[PDB]
Amino acid sequence: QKCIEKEVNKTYNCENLGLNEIPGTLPNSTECLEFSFNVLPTIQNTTFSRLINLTFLDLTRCQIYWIHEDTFQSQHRLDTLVLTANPLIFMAETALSGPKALKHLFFIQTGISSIDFIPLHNQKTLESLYLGSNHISSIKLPKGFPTEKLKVLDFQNNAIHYLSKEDMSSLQQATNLSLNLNGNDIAGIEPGAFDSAVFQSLNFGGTQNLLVIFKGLKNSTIQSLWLGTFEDMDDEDISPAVFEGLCEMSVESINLQKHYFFNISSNTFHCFSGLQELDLTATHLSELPSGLVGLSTLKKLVLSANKFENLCQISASNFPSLTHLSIKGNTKRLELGTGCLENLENLRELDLSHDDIETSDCCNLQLRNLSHLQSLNLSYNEPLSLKTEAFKECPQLELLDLAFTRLKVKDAQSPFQNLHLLKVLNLSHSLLDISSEQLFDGLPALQHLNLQGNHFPKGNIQKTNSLQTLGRLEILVLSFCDLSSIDQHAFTSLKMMNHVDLSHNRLTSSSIEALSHLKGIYLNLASNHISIILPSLLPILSQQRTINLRQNPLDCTCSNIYFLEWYKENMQKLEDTEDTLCENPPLLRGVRLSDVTLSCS
Amino acid sequence: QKCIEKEVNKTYNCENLGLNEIPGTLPNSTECLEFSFNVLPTIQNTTFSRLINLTFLDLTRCQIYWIHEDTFQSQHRLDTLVLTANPLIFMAETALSGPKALKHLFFIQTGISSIDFIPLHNQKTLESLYLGSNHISSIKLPKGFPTEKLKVLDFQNNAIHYLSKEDMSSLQQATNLSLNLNGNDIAGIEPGAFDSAVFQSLNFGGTQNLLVIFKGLKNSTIQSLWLGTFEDMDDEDISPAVFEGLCEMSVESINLQKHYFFNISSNTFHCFSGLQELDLTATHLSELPSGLVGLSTLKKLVLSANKFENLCQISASNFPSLTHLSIKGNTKRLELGTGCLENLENLRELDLSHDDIETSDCCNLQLRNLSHLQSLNLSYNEPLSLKTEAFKECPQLELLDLAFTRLKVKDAQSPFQNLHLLKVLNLSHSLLDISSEQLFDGLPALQHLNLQGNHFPKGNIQKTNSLQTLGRLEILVLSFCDLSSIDQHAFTSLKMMNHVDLSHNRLTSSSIEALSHLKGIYLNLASNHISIILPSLLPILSQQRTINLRQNPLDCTCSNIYFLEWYKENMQKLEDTEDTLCENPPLLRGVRLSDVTLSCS
Amino acid sequence: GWPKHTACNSGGLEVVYQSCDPLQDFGLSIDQCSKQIQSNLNIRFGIILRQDIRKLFLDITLMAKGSSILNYSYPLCEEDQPKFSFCGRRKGEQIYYAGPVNNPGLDVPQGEYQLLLELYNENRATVACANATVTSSEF
Amino acid sequence: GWPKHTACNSGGLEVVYQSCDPLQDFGLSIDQCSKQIQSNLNIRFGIILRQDIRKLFLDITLMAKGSSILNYSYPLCEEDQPKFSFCGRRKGEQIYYAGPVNNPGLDVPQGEYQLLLELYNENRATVACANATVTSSEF
């Protein structure tokens, strides 16, 4: 009443319509059916039998109690089946006989206590099984169920407290398997259960005894081992002894978010020497001591959401090899100090966002000796003052993010001087005066400039301006800049622009003239003051690839007839035509231009 | 509608009627409402507010998702509330403000993962809480739940795997508590958690680690400890080692059913010396060794459903204190042997039912020396031949059950001779000839004799029959005895009879003459061939307290007017009057006699 | 009535049933069907309970060609012996059982048989009622 | 609209809400309500998820006397930081949460305030919407 046609003859959204059967009007060609929140107490061989082409079927929370014999008989092409949140009493042996090539099965919160609820003997190529939020107490798969193709096995939020050798043997044929045991408190692991085990991901989130984990995982090889906990768990402190078993396994990446380390000292991490990445998010760190051992070949470190007072309190000498450091969302003001990171010779990425950082001189002292640095994030901080050449210490920089950080720059100063490799610069809501004309000197390679929410004198972009020197610029964002006008020669020297966002300003059609030299662009003119678009502008629009004119006070009178005809013939080229409406005459106010046909002289 | 009125103004069964509200036709005085299997997606302050006198309310499987503020506001007198099998999303703080004297609450299979789902701060006198078949993983009671009157806490079929000191201290204010953990796989108990603990019952049915339980229960005092397993659980190896912890515990009664004991060590029960009762039902026992230490003061033993060949294989020398012994449903034919129980001098009750026991001469050899036996059950066995004084070895018997066991007794023999204290004798389907005058000699105290399914020569009870020696008889069951007639003097010596069941025979009305000397009896004549009851029999009927004439071919013509008039005058002497129907004339066939009035003049 | 379900079809033996409880259906699948029925079969079974199952009994009534072969009664749950982990569960609970039943071995002569299976409590109230047809053929 | 529920009525502070998601209601109870709200209150909360909650954000919009006091946003679940055990659960799942919310302490001046609380995913699709009245009065 009625299903939403998302793609003609292919994809239908029937959610929340209180339906008791597939609508007669759904075509036989349907491939993607979104049927969640309907009412199907029993499903059976007649239910879906005409929908022979389904590849995706979502029956989330459809009040299904019964799946009778041959229910999916016609779904030979089924790739994904979602049966989440149905109060299932029984599933017939031959229910899944049809979808022999099924890849992904979601059986979350179906009230089951065992995988043998689900007769899976017809699924020889399954890739994903999601069994979260049930009564399950064992990871063991049904004997003879093929696992060669299994990549994701997910048991989040179950009643699994023990992993046996026999449990694990049921998984041996899979390769690069990810096993999600998040929300299962592991009380024991059978010694030898993890002999020669290989996993892509292994998640034991929220588990209450880490000693059991590190001992139990002896001999396994794991890419990402997720051992974080949560705010609603009342976890015991981590004692140094807990990490001993890590000596007898191979792990690339470990997450320990929200834990509390008791008695942090020089040897606590000795067993971490093989680790490539360590994430210590929100672990109540107010400092780390130096002389810490076991972390000197670590590449990636996360110390976000902690409570350092000073960047020097992280003791960077511990991590000579780092290529990535994140320390974002520090719960106090992070004082940056001087050369506090100078040790990090090979640092390539630094994230210091949301750190309440405050300084009236930046950033050569703070970033001292970080000359391999390629990406810097200083977004969402307090006001920063930048003198000319403020990033002298980081000449190889390719991305610089200062979004939502107010910037204080003096007249004719060039803070980005000598950043000859910078490709991406985000200055959203930095509140710079963009008429300061040395502003962007030293940026020959810049391709992407985001200037959303900055300031232009009198809301005009002048014929000569600070953007002119940016010869390789491809992407320019000038939305929310309170622009009234753009001089027709403002952009003439920017010949490689292909994405120009001028949305949420007060522009008229005269602004289009500034794009006459460009072809094939994306041009966003949404939420401006465009009304009439005269014939002499139409060749400029015809030149572009996509144009967004939604939420403009478009004129739907004969005075705008050439644009209105152009619009009907150029629907390919137009984005959001559904929100592109007439302002006048009053009769046509709020009517889509796509629904207007005038007769003029 | 339409609710079944079980008790006028008091008790209504509205189960399975698809109701969305309480019917307006239910009186304000309703005290017991069975409302299961209806449809109440939300319940709230208006749902029940007029039913102020409810003491029992069952909302089992009513599709309730929401319980809002003050739902039970008017149920001040509520004793039992059943919310089992409702998919509850939330229950308001004040939902149970009304029933402050609530005693028993059932919240089984409601999907809850925590006891704090149920705001119980208003229930200060709670006695029973049933939380089975949920996602609960701890027994810990929430802060400020009164435990003082709590006697039953039931967690059958949950996800509890550990019992800590803290968990156990949350129960300290309760006394004499029965805690059911059947169907929870307990993998650990915190040392000290059971220090000084005192329980009525503790059930860990099905648990996979008996060693853990006994060790964890150190220092507890338990009246009944139920540690049986089930046919659908894995076996663990049983040896003396498993029971070591029992030596540091006080237990009155223990059940170990369905564990695999077969080929038991003589040292298996050395920790059981405090036990009064031991249950080894269906434990694959084929024999017990002599010198089976640790049970010399055991009082009650159950060895039912095992596989002994001979009674001598229980080695009764092991149990000199036994007062009760049950060995029923043995899976092989059991040979009783001779004197196999002779050292059980204290034995009072012996159950040897369902054992396929057969013998040419019972029961002096088999029961040799059981001089204190008071109750003996030999029901459901193969043919036993009894000579005169068949129970000389057990002169003190008070109850003897031989139901469904064929008895072979030579002409003029008195097998029950000198059972001067026997009060209850069940010979249902023993196929004895009840006309033999000597059959029941020696039963002066007999009060209760069940002879359902026996026989008399030619379906007639003669003036001389086996019963005339039973002067103290009160209860006589002669139903299904293929009886055509009973001589008027058949029961004349039986002056203390007050309950005579003659139902399911072919008796006609003159059978009533056999009860002529009796007053105030219960007389069941259901399913006979009584049609006409002539006036001279009516005074006999008037003398009695209750007569059942249901399912007789009763005559509702003028040929029967004297009885018909009597019937109307004496409804208070009649049982099952709603199934006491006319058979003739055809016009009145199936009409209740209570609805008949004739005029004959 | 309720749909006809197949519990079992292999090794020459086919078992088809219909719930004979007007109130509800139930699900049943039998593993390792054959004309030579092995002892202690594994089943899967799903149902809503209409009574508590502290005391639960099974009747079997077997016939072929319009006359009785066998009547049998067997307890599943009793106060003195709960045989299965599901014993003691209550009215309204959804039950799923996948496990053994401990039937005896038996060979099924070719032919067709009518089976009535009834689960009931101590008051003879219906817990489940199955009307089944069992077909044995050459294999 | 959905019923008005009382989340809280203690220590001079009353909190009444109404779900403003037309699709559904939700349950909420707050423990240790007062005019001097301590940090890290415990709540009890139940709902059906209408979106997956791998990414979950809260907006708070506060006002009094038709005047906007505070607009705040806060993430509950993110890829780089799931704060809660419920993070990652999926559309259709029934959720019950009984646990702490990591709120700051604060005294609440006498008067009547209007609160809009909104839980949404990365596409701003509604998970929950509560429209609440907070009344502080002397105690």
Ligand SMILES: *[C@@H]1O[C@H](CO)[C@@H](O[C@@H]2O[C@H](CO)[C@@H](O[C@@H]3O[C@H](CO[C@H]4O[C@H](CO[C@H]5O[C@H](CO)[C@@H](O)[C@H](O)[C@@H]5O[C@H]5O[C@H](CO)[C@@H](O)[C@H](O)[C@@H]5O)[C@@H](O)[C@H](O[C@H]5O[C@H](CO)[C@@H](O)[C@H](O)[C@@H]5O[C@H]5O[C@H](CO)[C@@H](O)[C@H](O)[C@@H]5O)[C@@H]4O)[C@@H](O)[C@H](O[C@H]4O[C@H](CO)[C@@H](O)[C@H](O)[C@@H]4O)[C@@H]3O)[C@H](O)[C@H]2NC(C)=O)[C@H](O)[C@H]1NC(C)=O
């Ligand atoms: C001495 O020892 C005796 C034996 O141990 C004790 O016997 C007990 O006696 C009482 C009566 O006093 C009786 O209680 C009633 O039970 C009703 C339910 O009964 C079910 O089971 C019985 C017995 O089954 C066993 O025996 C048969 C016969 O050999 C066998 O075939 C079975 O497989 C089973 O044996 C197996 O199990 C046992 C126990 O585990 C093992 O020990 C053994 O090795 C085997 O493994 C059945 O016969 C019943 O079925 C009949 O009845 C139902 C209707 O209820 C019919 O639907 C069904 O088709 C069948 O019909 C047959 O009999 C009826 C007559 O009953 C005929 O009409 C018909 O033609 C058929 O022939 C059941 O499956 C229960 O309903 C009843 O409830 C009543 O009372 C309660 C409360 O008091 C009220 O709620 C109700 O309103 C009722 O009024 C009552 O409780 C026990 O059944 C019986 N026990 C045993 C084990 O036999 C005896 O008590 C003891 N003496 C003393 C003094 O203690």
Ligand SMILES: *[C@@H]1O[C@H](CO)[C@@H](O[C@@H]2O[C@H](CO)[C@@H](O[C@@H]3O[C@H](CO[C@H]4O[C@H](CO[C@H]5O[C@H](CO)[C@@H](O)[C@H](O)[C@@H]5O[C@H]5O[C@H](CO)[C@@H](O)[C@H](O)[C@@H]5O)[C@@H](O)[C@H](O[C@H]5O[C@H](CO)[C@@H](O)[C@H](O)[C@@H]5O)[C@@H]4O)[C@@H](O)[C@H](O[C@H]4O[C@H](CO)[C@@H](O)[C@H](O)[C@@H]4O)[C@@H]3O)[C@H](O)[C@H]2NC(C)=O)[C@H](O)[C@H]1NC(C)=O
């Ligand atoms: C450099 O670092 C920064 C900062 O770390 C990175 O910033 C990220 O930038 C991306 C790209 O723009 C953003 O992605 C988008 O996210 C939205 C959802 O946003 C929600 O969070 C917003 C931010 O909230 C934080 O900050 C505010 C303001 O300071 C603060 O008030 C909040 O409390 C919160 O801060 C806290 O949390 C942090 C993280 O845990 C802590 O670090 C910190 O200390 C604080 O505790 C928030 O503003 C927003 O609310 C607004 O928007 C919504 C509508 O969405 C509106 O309803 C509200 O009222 C607000 O106006 C949200 O709550 C997501 O919706 C977007 O998703 C679209 O796009 C993606 C991919 O493009 C698609 O997949 C989707 O389908 C969809 O279309 C998008 O993902 C991101 O939010 C931002 N992250 C943070 C933490 O700020 C930046 O990426 C880095 N640079 C580089 C180069 O990597």
Ligand SMILES: *[C@@H]1O[C@H](CO)[C@@H](O[C@@H]2O[C@H](CO)[C@@H](O)[C@H](O)[C@H]2NC(C)=O)[C@H](O)[C@H]1NC(C)=O
């Ligand atoms: C769905 O299955 C039903 C039930 O088996 C099928 O209906 C049966 O079809 C056979 C062959 O035509 C008939 O002999 C039966 O009498 C039918 N039974 C009933 C109850 O109608 C039905 O054909 C199937 N439908 C589809 C589309 O597969």
Ligand SMILES: *[C@@H]1O[C@H](CO)[C@@H](O[C@@H]2O[C@H](CO)[C@@H](O)[C@H](O)[C@H]2NC(C)=O)[C@H](O)[C@H]1NC(C)=O
């Ligand atoms: C500032 O702008 C840049 C460029 O658009 C944003 O960078 C993207 O960030 C996302 C993660 O947020 C990455 O996956 C993309 O690859 C980045 N893009 C590029 C081109 O590198 C950045 O997110 C913006 N910052 C803020 C705070 O919004």
Ligand SMILES: *[C@@H]1O[C@H](CO)[C@@H](O[C@@H]2O[C@H](CO)[C@@H](O)[C@H](O)[C@H]2NC(C)=O)[C@H](O)[C@H]1NC(C)=O
């Ligand atoms: C034989 O008859 C006797 C007497 O009615 C039955 O004994 C009763 O048995 C039950 C247990 O089934 C006890 O709870 C009662 O107390 C007994 N009554 C008396 C007076 O003792 C006995 O059950 C019958 N036997 C069979 C096999 O049915």
Ligand SMILES: *[C@@H]1O[C@H](CO)[C@@H](O)[C@H](O)[C@H]1NC(C)=O
């Ligand atoms: C969609 O179905 C209709 C009717 O068959 C038709 O107009 C249109 O061509 C179809 N498009 C497809 C199959 O892509």
Ligand SMILES: *[C@@H]1O[C@H](CO)[C@@H](O)[C@H](O)[C@H]1NC(C)=O
């Ligand atoms: C789809 O298939 C059915 C047969 O299943 C056929 O009769 C009909 O033409 C098709 N119906 C629709 C609505 O497309």
Ligand SMILES: *[C@@H]1O[C@H](CO)[C@@H](O)[C@H](O)[C@H]1NC(C)=O
């Ligand atoms: C696991 O054990 C084997 C055999 O002892 C050994 O070859 C291998 O190095 C070990 N692997 C890991 C990852 O510890």
Ligand SMILES: *[C@@H]1O[C@H](CO)[C@@H](O)[C@H](O)[C@H]1NC(C)=O
């Ligand atoms: C600065 O970086 C270089 C790496 O090029 C390193 O050799 C030197 O030690 C660093 N300086 C300090 C003070 O650590």
Ligand SMILES: *[C@@H]1O[C@H](CO)[C@@H](O)[C@H](O)[C@H]1NC(C)=O
């Ligand atoms: C039932 O209630 C009515 C009140 O309408 C009363 O007249 C009647 O006496 C009651 N019946 C019994 C048996 O208590």
Ligand SMILES: *[C@@H]1O[C@H](CO)[C@@H](O)[C@H](O)[C@H]1NC(C)=O
């Ligand atoms: C139920 O509560 C509503 C809403 O609070 C109230 O208006 C109504 O008076 C109440 N009705 C009863 C019977 O208590």
Ligand SMILES: *[C@@H]1O[C@H](CO)[C@@H](O)[C@H](O)[C@H]1NC(C)=O
């Ligand atoms: C039944 O209760 C209603 C509402 O509480 C009340 O108005 C009325 O007095 C009662 N009816 C009778 C017959 O007592």
Ligand SMILES: *[C@@H]1O[C@H](CO)[C@@H](O)[C@H](O)[C@H]1NC(C)=O
């Ligand atoms: C419990 O331990 C105490 C102190 O050791 C001991 O005296 C007492 O007898 C024990 N009680 C039981 C029931 O084991």
Ligand SMILES: *[C@@H]1O[C@H](CO)[C@@H](O)[C@H](O)[C@H]1NC(C)=O
């Ligand atoms: C028989 O019973 C008496 C007690 O009545 C006892 O002293 C004697 O030992 C018993 N006989 C045997 C052989 O055990």
Ligand SMILES: *[C@@H]1O[C@H](CO)[C@@H](O)[C@H](O)[C@H]1NC(C)=O
């Ligand atoms: C079994 O099924 C047949 C019809 O298919 C019917 O005649 C018979 O009465 C059924 N038996 C029961 C008990 O329902």
Ligand SMILES: *[C@@H]1O[C@H](CO)[C@@H](O)[C@H](O)[C@H]1NC(C)=O
């Ligand atoms: C089974 O019971 C029926 C009906 O009561 C009876 O007619 C039949 O003879 C019994 N069958 C057997 C094989 O004893």
